C-alpha cells in the first residue's frame, strides 16, 4: 500500500531477505549509484547499548544493479511501530 | 513513425541514462 497506481515498471529483482539478526544491533549499508549501476553493500554488528561507538569495521558489498536513473535526493521509509 | 528521437535538452545525457522528442521519417 506504499506506493499507488504502479506504472511502465522497467526493472524488478526478489532474493532472500536483506536485513537478518538485548544489545542494539548495528547494521552497515553503502547506496552509490556509478554509470547506471546501483551498488548495495552490507555487513551486521552486535553494538552494547545516543552514540555511534568509537570502533573500527568493515562492510562487504552484496549486489549491484543497472537502474540507469538520475538520482538527486533519497528518503528512509520506516514503520509507525 | 513507432520511433523517435530527440535533438533539444537542456543538458546533455549521462553514461547509461534513459531520458523518458521528434520521429524519424524512415523511407
Known amino acids: 500500500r506504499v506506493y499507488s497506481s504502479a506504472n511502465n515498471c522497467t526493472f524488478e529483482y526478489v532474493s532472500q531477505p536483506f536485513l537478518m539478526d538485548n544489545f542494539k544491533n548495528l547494521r552497515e549499508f553503502v547506496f552509490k549509484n556509478i554509470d547506471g549501476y546501483f551498488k548495495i553493500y552490507s555487513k551486521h554488528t552486535p553494538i552494547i547499548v545516543e552514540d555511534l561507538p568509537q570502533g573500527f569495521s568493515a562492510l562487504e558489498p552484496l549486489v549491484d544493479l543497472p537502474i540507469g536513473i538520475n538520482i538527486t535526493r533519497f528518503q528512509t521509509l520506516l514503520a509507525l511501530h | ?27
Open chain 2, 1 to 27: 513513425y513507432n520511433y523517435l528521437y530527440r535533438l533539444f535538452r537542456k543538458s546533455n545525457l549521462k553514461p547509461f541514462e534513459r531520458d523518458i522528442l521528434r520521429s524519424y521519417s524512415f523511407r
